[PDB]
Structure formats: C-alpha cells, structure tokens
C-alpha cells in the first residue's frame, strides 16, 4: 500500500525529503507550525486512551518505523534552521517522544549522529590549532581554515543542538531529581568525544603563547559552549578538590577522563586566555559561560567586582531623602537613634542631607565620604568595648569576648552592619581590619585550625605540643573547651560527654576542631551576628559567595598599595642569603606581579593590610617591633611555603629555578582556605 493513501500524514512527511523544498524559512516554518498540531494531539489521543479507546479503530493511529521517527530530526543538522525553526522542532521531538517504542530509536539515531560529525573536527580542529603561533605576529590566517568555523553553516552549531537537544529530552518538565543522571553521562561517553576535547586544549592554550592580527579568540566559542553543556550537570561541584602538590606542567592528557572529571581539571590550564574575555565582553556572563560562577577561584578580582556590580541592584529610582542633622561630635549614636527604621527595604534608598554643624555645600555634595571614614575612626570607639585591637597588635581589630557588657551592643551591631553595607551599597574605601578569622564568619567555611599558631599562641602553645610528639593518650585532657563567662570557669560540654569524654587518639580532631569553633564562634559571634543580620538582611549570602573570605578585606578596605624598596632593604634572612637565586628573579617579577598579586601575598603573612608606614621596618605585631626573617627549616624542598603572621615567620623550601618557586609561591597566595586555614 505504501501507507501514501491509507494515511494523509504520511504526504506531509514525503515533503521533507525533497531538495527542491527545505531551502527556505517560510515552508519549512510552516510545515513546522502544521505538524505542531497533529503531533501534539497524536500524542496526546493515544496516550489518553487506555480504556475507551474507540479512536485508534477510526483514525488507524499510525505505527512509528526507523524512517518514520529519523525523517523528523534529520533536518535539525540542516542548512536552513533559524532560531524560529529550532524552538518548534525540539517541541516536536518532545511531544512524539511520549508515544511507545520511540525513545530507543531517537536515542540510537543521536549518538550516530554524534560519532558521524565528530570526526570532521579533529581533521580540522588540528589544522587550525597547528597554525596559530606558526609563521609571524602580523600576519594572516588563510580564511579556508576560518571558514568552517565563521559560517552560521558550520559544524559545531550541530554539535551543540544536538547536545541541547539530548540534554532537553531527558531535562524537560520530568522531575530533575527524578531524572536519571548517570546514564546521560553514558551518552556523550558512548560519543567518541576525547580527542576532540582533548585537542581543543592544545588551540585554547595556543593564543596565549603568540600573535595575530586575526587574534580573536572567540571564533572557537561555539565549542566552549557544548563543553560546558557536556559538564552542565554532571556534579560541577565538590569535584574541584584537589591542590596538595603544584604540578608545574601542563601536559593536558585528556584521552577519556571519564566525563565528570573533564572539568575542573580543564579551565584551570586555560584561565588567562579566559579571564582576559569577560573584560572584553562583560555580557558573556549570562548565557554562554554562565556555569563559570560555580567556580570562584578561576575568577580574578577586576571580572568579579563588575560582575557584581552591574547584577547588584541597578533597578532603583534615585533616593528620596535622609534628613539626619549629626552635629559631627557625637555622629555614631545621634544617626543610631535618628534613623530609627528608614525604611530597611529601601534604607539605601536616602541621600546622607547631613551638615557638620553649620557648613554649606562645597566641593559638591556627598561630602560624608569623610564621615564614613572618620565615622571608622570613630566606629572603634575605644572608649566602648564592642571591640578589641586584636592584643596580637592593634594593627586590627577583634571580636572581644567582652562585647556584650555594654547595655545597648544589640542595635549598635545592626546599624554598623547595614552602614557598612552602605559604603558597599556605592563604591567607597572605608578603612577597616578584622583579620581572616572574623571574614569566615561571614562567608560560608569552618574555622581553621593553623590561625592558632599565629592568631594567639597562648592556647596553641596549650595544644602546640599536643598533636605530635607528645599525642600517645599519655595526657588525658578531659574534653570540652574552658568556658569564659565573667564568674565560674565551668568548662561547657563541648560534645554531650565533654567532660566524661577524654580526648583520646580517637576524639582528636572533634575536640579539637570545637575547641578552636568555641574561642571563633561561641563568643559574641551570636551577638556580631546581629551585624551580620542586617548585613545579610541588606545583601543576601548568596549574593556575596563569589568572593572568598580573604578578598572581603579587598572589598571593605580600598585596594592597598606598597612599594619595593622598604621591602627590599628592611628584610632579615635566618640561615639564608635572601634567596637560593631563585627569590632573585621573583623579587624582580614583584613589579610585574600585579598590585592583587603583591598584595595578596602580604595578607599571607600579615592578613590584616593597613601599611604599616616608616618604610616596613615599623613591623608593629604583639612584641611593637618586628622583621620579617626568611627561615629555611629544611623541610621537603618540595613542599608549600609557610608563615606565621605572629612574628612574620616566612619560609621557603629549597626549590631550584623558575617557574617552580614561582608558581608554588603563586599557588600559595591563591591558596587561602585549605592552606594557612582550614588545613
């Protein structure tokens, strides 16, 4: 019969596969619109037919075959498809999907798909990779070789339908967590995909070793795209773990590595090439690289702060007013007491319409800049205890267990909490330390155990002993911690049986890790929360986790600068000759070190900023003077530098020459959390 007559459909169908159609938009358009309603319907009918089922007798609902379900999506790898075509081609998929015996077929004819097209890449993708850095810096690129990727008639465009549309079929409406993720990582594993991944590295790694006029990184954004689709969703998180030992070499073998493993290992190999796109571009944050946000640390500072600028909250109408008449003497408790609740929602929302006591308007408005700064001068305040200049040197300032004798701390705290908010709430460079610690109580992480050693002695050198040595169970130290409460020292139960439970070789790290929690968090943390409240109030948590608990200074403190020569000369050197050569050539690249990257490294072994003046030698820690002493402590000569910000420790383990110090010591600053903290 050939189906032709015993069925209208089916000569609708006979039209996609005719050359002389299916090379224009308005048909295949409409064709597209038509089937759009017997599909959805078809769909629809048998499906809802289980018992009263008198339809299928009438209309002969037809029987799918190999032909049957390929000629629909044989089109979607066609040179015709707009983005109108495709949006109703996917529905259509969609919608016969839900009829029997057809998952199977579009399943098999997609991965065949998939083999088929890659392979014409690599057969070209190394063409193209081999050329760049090849004949010269101002040259040309034969436009063949670029002419298969500029078209919109290219290949990779249907390597990332294809994915999109595999990812929408077994994404779309269902239930994610009902989805089934695992075997979607089977599909693209049964595609022969590796090599091409794999040789992709050796094309996004070869702009930032040469020059061309053509230059234009971004011909090869196509791929970039489907290769963050691959990991869209296969865990893209929690797999970044890893650091330990600094590789110091790229090599990049990407043969198979499963397809969960593709890709933090990737993107770190490739972050100058990829930061220096965003700047370029700032839009390429919504859309195509907008999976890069679960990965903070391949994200540096200057792409960061716009990024959450432009997002923060552009969508206001100006401000309406702030009528506060601070009479410049008294400021802090005049604006707790005068702005009451202005409007906390739309707080920010109110221009500071205050006067010293008299002044006019001079050196044009906004002219409270300088009463953010002194009010930091004056937020101290060491007349009252809300805080205490970090005994270890008042360089910064403490949490001060003994915060909550003052009678009106509460309210304090959320003024101050929201305030500064505000300064972060426009772009100002308020000054402000609170050491590393009191960041981590705002970004999400646990306190860290080597900040003892530095932070105060006094109860490491309780524990400095313990954990090697002398950690046989041959002390007992009954668990919990010693508990401060302005009377009886009755140590609290830690854990239920504290007291009862000894630390033993087994409660080690428990005790330990709580013992260091207490001192951190069960002190006025639940009071400075209530700067944190506001805080948070005013700008979600989410809304902050892009930074890191060591860039948050950066935030609050405008970006500090120092010189060379006072760091040069006002040093010391333990056992050293200032360096094994290597030191040498990083204490020229100081200079080209960029001011994040030479700042960064002083918060390693100071963590509180605030340039100490008089040229470095003012080195004013817990003892009032002090010098940074480079020690070589013969340790592994392969293992990470330390320090220890107490009495500016320093450390380097022999290395041998460039590149291996340099990016140990990079890898060092870039560590913060699970070095120096946590670890």
Same mark, same amino acid.
């Given at each position: 019969?050939?189906?032709?007559?015993?069925?209208?459909?089916?000569?609708?169908?006979?039209?996609?596969?005719?050359?002389?159609?299916?090379?224009? *938009?308005? @048909?295949?358009?409409?064709? =597209?619109?038509?089937?759009?309603?017997?599909? #959805?319907? /078809?769909?629809? $009918?048998? &499906?809802?037919?289980?018992?009263?089922?008198?339809?299928?007798?009438?209309?002969?609902?037809?029987?799918?075959?190999?032909?049957?379900?390929?000629?629909?999506?044989?089109?979607?790898?066609?040179?015709?498809?707009?983005?109108?075509?495709?949006?109703?081609?996917?529905?259509?998929?969609?919608?016969?999907?839900?009829?029997?015996?057809?998952?199977?077929?579009?399943?098999?004819?997609?991965?065949?798909?998939?083999?088929?097209?890659?392979?014409?890449?690599?057969?070209?993708?190394?063409?193209?990779?081999?050329?760049?850095?090849?004949?010269?810096?101002?040259?040309?690129?034969? *436009?063949? @070789?670029?002419?298969?990727? =500029?078209?919109?008639?290219?290949?990779?465009? #249907?390597? /990332?339908?294809? $994915?999109? &549309?595999?990812?929408?079929?077994?994404?779309?409406?269902?239930?994610?967590?009902?989805?089934?993720?695992?075997?979607?990582?089977?599909?693209?594993?049964?595609?022969?995909?590796?090599?091409?991944?794999?040789?992709?590295?050796?094309?996004?790694?070869?702009?930032?070793?040469?020059?061309?006029?053509?230059?234009?990184?971004?011909?090869?954004?196509?791929?970039?795209?489907?290769?963050?689709?691959?990991?869209?969703?296969?865990?893209?998180?929690?797999?970044?773990?890893?650091?330990?030992?600094?590789?110091?070499?790229?090599?990049?073998?990407?043969?198979?590595?499963?397809?969960?493993?593709?890709?933090?290992?990737?993107?770190?190999?490739?972050?100058?090439?990829?930061?220096?796109?965003?700047?370029?571009?700032?839009?390429?944050?919504?859309?195509?690289?907008?999976?890069?946000?679960?990965?903070?640390?391949?994200?540096?500072?200057?792409?960061?702060?716009?990024?959450?600028?432009?997002?923060?909250?552009?969508?206001?109408?100006?401000?309406?007013?702030?009528?506060?008449?601070?009479?410049?003497?008294?400021?802090?408790?005049?604006?707790?007491?005068?702005?009451?609740?202005?409007?906390?929602?739309?707080?920010?929302?109110?221009?500071?319409?205050?006067?010293?006591?008299?002044?006019?308007?001079?050196?044009?408005?906004?002219?409270?800049?300088?009463?953010?700064?002194?009010?930091?001068?004056?937020?101290?305040?060491?007349?009252?205890?809300?805080?205490?200049?970090?005994?270890?040197?008042?360089?910064?300032?403490?949490?001060?267990?003994?915060?909550?004798?003052?009678?009106?701390?509460?309210?304090?705290?959320?003024?101050?909490?929201?305030?500064?908010?505000?300064?972060?709430?426009?772009?100002?460079?308020?000054?402000?330390?609170?050491?590393?610690?009191?960041?981590?109580?705002?970004?999400?992480?646990?306190?860290?155990?080597?900040?003892?050693?530095?932070?105060?002695?006094?109860?490491?050198?309780?524990?400095?002993?313990?954990?090697?040595?002398?950690?046989?169970?041959?002390?007992?130290?009954?668990?919990?911690?010693?508990?401060?409460?302005?009377?009886?020292?009755?140590?609290?139960?830690?854990?239920?049986?504290?007291?009862?439970?000894?630390?033993?070789?087994?409660?080690?790290?428990?005790?330990?890790?709580?013992?260091?929690?207490?001192?951190?968090?069960?002190?006025?943390?639940?009071?400075?929360?209530?700067?944190?409240?506001?805080?948070?109030?005013?700008?979600?948590?989410?809304?902050?986790?892009?930074?890191?608990?060591?860039?948050?200074?950066?935030?609050?403190?405008?970006?500090?600068?120092?010189?060379?020569?006072?760091?040069?000369?006002?040093?010391?050197?333990?056992?050293?000759?200032?360096?094994?050569?290597?030191?040498?050539?990083?204490?020229?690249?100081?200079?080209?070190?960029?001011?994040?990257?030479?700042?960064?490294?002083?918060?390693?072994?100071?963590?509180?900023?605030?340039?100490?003046?008089?040229?470095?030698?003012?080195?004013?820690?817990?003892?009032?003077?002090?010098?940074?002493?480079?020690?070589?402590?013969?340790?592994?000569?392969?293992?990470?530098?330390?320090?220890?910000?107490?009495?500016?420790?320093?450390?380097?383990?022999?290395?041998?020459?460039?590149?291996?110090?340099?990016?140990?010591?990079?890898?060092?600053?870039?560590?913060?959390?699970?070095?120096?903290?946590?670890?």
């Amino acid at each position: 019969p050939d189906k032709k007559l015993r069925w209208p459909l089916w000569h609708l169908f006979s039209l996609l596969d005719r050359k002389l159609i299916t090379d224009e *938009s308005v @048909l295949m358009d409409l064709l =597209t619109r038509i089937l759009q309603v017997c599909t #959805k319907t /078809l769909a629809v $009918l048998s &499906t809802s037919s289980n018992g009263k089922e008198n339809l299928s007798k009438k209309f002969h609902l037809p029987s799918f075959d190999e032909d049957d379900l390929m000629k629909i999506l044989s089109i979607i790898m066609l040179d015709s498809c707009t983005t109108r075509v495709f949006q109703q081609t996917l529905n259509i998929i969609y919608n016969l999907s839900k009829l029997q015996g057809c998952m199977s077929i579009f399943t098999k004819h997609l991965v065949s798909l998939a083999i088929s097209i890659m392979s014409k890449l690599k057969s070209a993708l190394d063409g193209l990779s081999r050329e760049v850095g090849t004949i010269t810096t101002g040259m040309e690129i034969n *436009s063949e @070789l670029l002419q298969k990727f =500029t078209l919109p008639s290219s290949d990779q465009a #249907k390597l /990332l339908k294809i $994915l999109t &549309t595999v990812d929408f079929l077994y994404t779309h409406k269902r239930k994610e967590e009902e989805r089934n993720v695992k075997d979607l990582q089977s599909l693209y594993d049964k595609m022969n995909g590796g090599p091409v991944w794999s040789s992709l590295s050796e094309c996004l790694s070869q702009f930032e070793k040469s020059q061309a006029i053509n230059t234009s990184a971004t011909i090869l954004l196509p791929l970039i795209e489907s290769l963050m689709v691959v990991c869209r969703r296969s865990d893209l998180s929690q797999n970044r773990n890893t650091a330990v030992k600094y590789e110091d070499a790229k090599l990049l073998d990407f043969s198979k590595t499963r397809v969960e493993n593709l890709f933090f290992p990737f993107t770190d190999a490739h972050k100058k090439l990829l930061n220096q796109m965003i700047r370029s571009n700032p839009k390429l944050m919504s859309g195509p690289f907008a999976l890069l946000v679960k990965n903070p640390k391949v994200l540096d500072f200057d792409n960061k702060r716009y990024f959450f600028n432009a997002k923060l909250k552009s969508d206001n109408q100006e401000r309406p007013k702030l009528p506060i008449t601070v009479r410049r003497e008294q400021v802090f408790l005049d604006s707790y007491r005068a702005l009451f609740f202005k409007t906390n929602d739309e707080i920010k929302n109110s221009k500071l319409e205050i006067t010293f006591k008299g002044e006019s308007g001079v050196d044009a408005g906004g002219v409270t800049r300088e009463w953010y700064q002194v009010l930091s001068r004056q937020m101290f305040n060491p007349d009252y205890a809300l805080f205490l200049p970090v005994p270890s040197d008042k360089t910064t300032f403490h949490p001060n267990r003994t915060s909550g004798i003052n009678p009106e701390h509460l309210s304090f705290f959320k003024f101050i909490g929201m305030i500064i908010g505000k300064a972060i709430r426009d772009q100002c460079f308020l000054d402000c330390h609170f050491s590393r610690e009191v960041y981590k109580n705002i970004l999400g992480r646990p306190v860290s155990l080597k900040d003892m050693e530095s932070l105060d002695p006094d109860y490491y050198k309780s524990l400095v002993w313990i954990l090697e040595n002398d950690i046989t169970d041959i002390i007992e130290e009954t668990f919990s911690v010693e508990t401060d409460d302005y009377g009886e020292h009755k140590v609290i139960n830690l854990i239920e049986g504290g007291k009862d439970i000894i630390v033993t070789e087994a409660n080690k790290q428990d005790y330990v890790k709580k013992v260091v929690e207490y001192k951190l968090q069960t002190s006025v943390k639940e009071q400075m929360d209530n700067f944190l409240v506001g805080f948070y109030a005013l700008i979600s948590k989410d809304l902050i986790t892009i930074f890191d608990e060591q860039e948050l200074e950066l935030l609050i403190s405008g970006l500090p600068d120092i010189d060379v020569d006072d760091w040069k000369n006002n040093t010391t050197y333990v056992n050293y000759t200032a360096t094994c050569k290597e030191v040498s050539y990083f204490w020229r690249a100081v200079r080209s070190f960029d001011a994040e990257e030479r700042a960064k490294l002083l918060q390693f072994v100071t963590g509180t900023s605030k340039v100490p003046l008089n040229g470095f030698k003012e080195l004013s820690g817990v003892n009032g003077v002090c010098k940074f002493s480079i020690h070589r402590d013969f340790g592994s000569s392969e293992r990470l530098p330390s320090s220890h910000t107490c009495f500016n420790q320093l450390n380097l383990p022999p290395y041998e020459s460039y590149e291996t110090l340099r990016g140990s010591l990079l890898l060092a600053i870039n560590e913060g959390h699970e070095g120096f903290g946590l670890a």
